[PDB]
Amino acid sequence: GAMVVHEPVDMTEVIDRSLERVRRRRSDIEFEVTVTPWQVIGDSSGLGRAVLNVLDNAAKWSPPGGRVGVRLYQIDPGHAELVITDQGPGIPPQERHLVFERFFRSASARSMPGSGLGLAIVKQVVLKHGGALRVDYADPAAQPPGTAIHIVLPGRPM
Ligand SMILES: Nc1ncnc2c1ncn2[C@@H]1O[C@H](COP(=O)(O)OP(=O)(O)OP(=O)(O)O)[C@@H](O)[C@H]1O
Ligand SMILES: [Mg+2]
């Protein structure tokens, strides 16, 4: 099967590389980045693909001048949580079980080119690294509430 890469991965570099790519596509977005140093054992290319796919969605559905939050904090001795947030329409509660399935398309989000594979890839990468993920509103009290993608990754503080 596909090569299984199991090497130390600096998540600060993974996120910084992913951000460089997407800042090009939407230079108006205010990316608010708060990343605690975190090392994951795995596949830097796969993790980079997963973070870029989430950042790409956050940018696509960001309003002009929108803020995208990119936050990674340790939550216990062996895990950290990456939360990527936008000020887009958000994904409503009833759809949150189609998110991460191939070919999902939200009726709340404006139709854009893309065939609905990015988040299925994210789920695969995160599971292959022993993580977990979920979707929620970024700020339920705000209009619009935005989407928050939450990714928990095992690893260690650097
Ligand atoms: N941050 C977000 N804000 C609003 N809607 C989102 C967001 N992220 C994902 N979605 C919705 O979930 C769908 C699935 O997302 P996903 O990234 O898997 O597919 P895509 O972006 O349409 O295509 P691809 O990622 O394959 O280019 C999107 O088409 C969109 O309806
Ligand atoms: Mg996508």
mmCIF file of C-alpha atoms in Angstrom, residues 44-132:
data_model
loop_
_atom_site.group_PDB
_atom_site.id
_atom_site.type_symbol
_atom_site.label_atom_id
_atom_site.label_comp_id
_atom_site.label_asym_id
_atom_site.label_seq_id
_atom_site.Cartn_x
_atom_site.Cartn_y
_atom_site.Cartn_z
ATOM 1 C CA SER A 44 4.606 15.922 6.870
ATOM 2 C CA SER A 45 3.257 15.870 3.302
ATOM 3 C CA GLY A 46 -0.035 14.347 4.408
ATOM 4 C CA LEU A 47 -0.385 16.745 7.326
ATOM 5 C CA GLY A 48 0.453 19.667 5.068
ATOM 6 C CA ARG A 49 -2.195 18.538 2.612
ATOM 7 C CA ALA A 50 -4.740 18.286 5.413
ATOM 8 C CA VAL A 51 -4.027 21.729 6.870
ATOM 9 C CA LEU A 52 -3.957 23.348 3.408
ATOM 10 C CA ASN A 53 -7.290 21.766 2.531
ATOM 11 C CA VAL A 54 -8.898 23.265 5.652
ATOM 12 C CA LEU A 55 -7.241 26.648 5.122
ATOM 13 C CA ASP A 56 -8.361 26.626 1.497
ATOM 14 C CA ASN A 57 -12.019 26.161 2.538
ATOM 15 C CA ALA A 58 -11.696 28.851 5.162
ATOM 16 C CA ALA A 59 -10.414 31.255 2.514
ATOM 17 C CA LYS A 60 -12.924 30.275 -0.179
ATOM 18 C CA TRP A 61 -15.943 31.108 1.952
ATOM 19 C CA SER A 62 -14.399 34.053 3.828
ATOM 20 C CA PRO A 63 -16.021 37.417 3.168
ATOM 21 C CA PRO A 64 -13.806 40.130 1.705
ATOM 22 C CA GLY A 65 -11.478 41.269 4.452
ATOM 23 C CA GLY A 66 -12.540 38.328 6.605
ATOM 24 C CA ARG A 67 -10.461 37.058 9.465
ATOM 25 C CA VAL A 68 -9.287 33.453 9.541
ATOM 26 C CA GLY A 69 -8.110 32.126 12.894
ATOM 27 C CA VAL A 70 -5.440 29.430 13.008
ATOM 28 C CA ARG A 71 -4.899 28.302 16.579
ATOM 29 C CA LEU A 72 -2.992 25.347 17.952
ATOM 30 C CA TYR A 73 -2.915 24.767 21.701
ATOM 31 C CA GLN A 74 -1.942 21.810 23.856
ATOM 32 C CA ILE A 75 -5.018 20.330 25.581
ATOM 33 C CA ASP A 76 -3.397 17.442 27.617
ATOM 34 C CA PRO A 77 0.106 15.909 28.093
ATOM 35 C CA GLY A 78 -0.130 14.074 24.771
ATOM 36 C CA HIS A 79 -2.501 16.056 22.555
ATOM 37 C CA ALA A 80 -2.992 19.435 20.933
ATOM 38 C CA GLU A 81 -5.918 20.907 19.088
ATOM 39 C CA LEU A 82 -5.743 22.865 15.837
ATOM 40 C CA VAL A 83 -8.760 25.084 15.287
ATOM 41 C CA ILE A 84 -9.194 26.871 11.966
ATOM 42 C CA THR A 85 -11.997 29.416 11.917
ATOM 43 C CA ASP A 86 -13.594 31.772 9.427
ATOM 44 C CA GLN A 87 -16.350 34.391 9.228
ATOM 45 C CA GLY A 88 -18.253 32.649 6.473
ATOM 46 C CA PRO A 89 -21.786 31.310 6.655
ATOM 47 C CA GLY A 90 -20.950 28.333 8.844
ATOM 48 C CA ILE A 91 -22.106 24.749 8.405
ATOM 49 C CA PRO A 92 -25.460 24.236 10.189
ATOM 50 C CA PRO A 93 -25.935 21.477 12.787
ATOM 51 C CA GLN A 94 -27.967 19.089 10.621
ATOM 52 C CA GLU A 95 -25.279 18.928 7.886
ATOM 53 C CA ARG A 96 -22.344 18.420 10.239
ATOM 54 C CA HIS A 97 -22.586 14.610 9.660
ATOM 55 C CA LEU A 98 -22.017 14.962 5.896
ATOM 56 C CA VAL A 99 -18.898 17.022 6.475
ATOM 57 C CA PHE A 100 -15.770 14.966 5.742
ATOM 58 C CA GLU A 101 -17.770 12.691 3.352
ATOM 59 C CA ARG A 102 -16.887 12.795 -0.334
ATOM 60 C CA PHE A 103 -19.155 14.950 -2.488
ATOM 61 C CA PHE A 104 -20.792 16.876 0.345
ATOM 62 C CA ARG A 105 -21.930 20.370 -0.672
ATOM 63 C CA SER A 106 -23.542 22.759 1.832
ATOM 64 C CA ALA A 107 -26.690 24.610 0.766
ATOM 65 C CA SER A 108 -25.584 27.413 3.169
ATOM 66 C CA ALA A 109 -22.354 28.117 1.277
ATOM 67 C CA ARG A 110 -22.199 29.672 -2.168
ATOM 68 C CA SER A 111 -21.425 27.268 -4.996
ATOM 69 C CA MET A 112 -17.766 27.295 -6.001
ATOM 70 C CA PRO A 113 -15.582 25.111 -8.212
ATOM 71 C CA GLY A 114 -14.408 22.008 -6.409
ATOM 72 C CA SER A 115 -15.791 18.488 -6.396
ATOM 73 C CA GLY A 116 -15.977 17.821 -2.661
ATOM 74 C CA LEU A 117 -12.902 15.739 -1.927
ATOM 75 C CA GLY A 118 -10.772 18.030 0.268
ATOM 76 C CA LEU A 119 -12.303 17.275 3.644
ATOM 77 C CA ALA A 120 -12.525 13.525 3.041
ATOM 78 C CA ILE A 121 -8.734 13.699 2.561
ATOM 79 C CA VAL A 122 -8.423 15.677 5.804
ATOM 80 C CA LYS A 123 -10.347 13.007 7.760
ATOM 81 C CA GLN A 124 -8.161 10.238 6.287
ATOM 82 C CA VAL A 125 -4.903 12.013 7.184
ATOM 83 C CA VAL A 126 -6.086 12.912 10.666
ATOM 84 C CA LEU A 127 -7.254 9.364 11.396
ATOM 85 C CA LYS A 128 -4.037 7.879 9.998
ATOM 86 C CA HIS A 129 -2.190 10.041 12.582
ATOM 87 C CA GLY A 130 -4.410 8.924 15.458
ATOM 88 C CA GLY A 131 -6.309 12.179 15.656
ATOM 89 C CA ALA A 132 -9.925 13.254 15.777
#
